[PDB]
Amino acid sequence: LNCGQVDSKMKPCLTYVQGGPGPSGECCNGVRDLHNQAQSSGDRQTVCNCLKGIARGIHNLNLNNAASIPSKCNVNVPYTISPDIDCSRIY
Ligand SMILES: CCCCCCCCCCCCCCCC(=O)O
Numbered sequence: 001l002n003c004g005q006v007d008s009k010m011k012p013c014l015t016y017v018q019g020g021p022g023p024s025g026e027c028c029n030g031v032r033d034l035h036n037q038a039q040s041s042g043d044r045q046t047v048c049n050c051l052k053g054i055a056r057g058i059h060n061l062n063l064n065n066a067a068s069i070p071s072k073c074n075v076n077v078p079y080t081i082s083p084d085i086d087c088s089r090i091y
Contacts, residue, residue, distance in 0.1 A: 006047045012026065013027035013065075017066050052085050078090060
């Protein structure tokens with residue numbers, strides 16, 4: 001999934017993880033799309049590395065916001081918009 005997408009999608013929610021008046025539902029949804037489009041470790045990797053990339057290239061990512069997204073979005077998974085994910089294997 002062409003990285004820039006990931007970022008261009010995550011970006012408003014990123015505002016949320018740093019201190020945004022989010023999320024608007026959009027995240028949960030767009031997120032699932034990347035989680036539905038990406039299926040096995042290999043597609044996810046590129047994307048995770050990019051979403052992570054931004055998590056890293058933010059100010060003070062607030063763990064909650066991030067974990068929260070799968071937690072409330074209901075995307076039953078190991079990763080959630082962070083700098084330190086299991087992007088590695090994802091299994
Ligand atoms: C494992 C690859 C990660 C990206 C694709 C899987 C979905 C990531 C789950 C977190 C979604 C983040 C929502 C937008 C960013 C944010 O909440 O600030």
